[PDB]
Subunit: 129 residues, 2 copies
Amino acid sequence: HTTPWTNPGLAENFMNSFMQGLSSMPGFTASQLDDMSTIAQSMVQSIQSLAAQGRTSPNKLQALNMAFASSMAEIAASEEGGGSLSTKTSSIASAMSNAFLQTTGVVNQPFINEITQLVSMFAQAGMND
Amino acid sequence: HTTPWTNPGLAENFMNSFMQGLSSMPGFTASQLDDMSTIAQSMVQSIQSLAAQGRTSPNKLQALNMAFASSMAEIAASEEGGGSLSTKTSSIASAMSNAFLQTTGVVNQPFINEITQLVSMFAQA
């Protein structure tokens, strides 16, 4: 059960792989990708800082991986333009699948399912006020 | 720039206020509260770094505030012990309410409801 929350290096590699893959995928504008990359790099940096202090654990990395994926889902759902919501959702799922394959070598389907659900939940709910 | 979703200093205030509120609530072990505090501290520092570089925006702050809330929901849902799922849920909702009062003075109830829904979704997964 190697996952992106097994250790800091896999967590960082997963996030970087996701962004790399997404940026060749349909459905997103250049500024949407820029926002996602900015957040991705801030989270990689946060993990590097925690790791330097011996403050990561699988539970903390699992939560941080959810922080990352939920940020991506939120950007997808809230920034208008670039493609249909279903295209955005399928591109996120494809980029996550590839990110697993490139890093741990093993897709976590339950995680991909959670994130696709987040896209629809966030699109319906939204963020106003 | 009057809410945590548009003002980095208010976003940082909201996250610190959430943790302060949660630390007086039931349902979490000391280890779980440590996990939550560590993640909150990380997120606050991330926003401070981005703000210093002019790299925050309303869309990016919205995304980061949701990232924070989802990470709290995921800890509640996945880490066993310390209290029932309902207690954990109620405690997060209370700490979120107080975090709004301490920042904007106006509770965003639909946002609180959305986080309560995340706790259940993550728990079922």
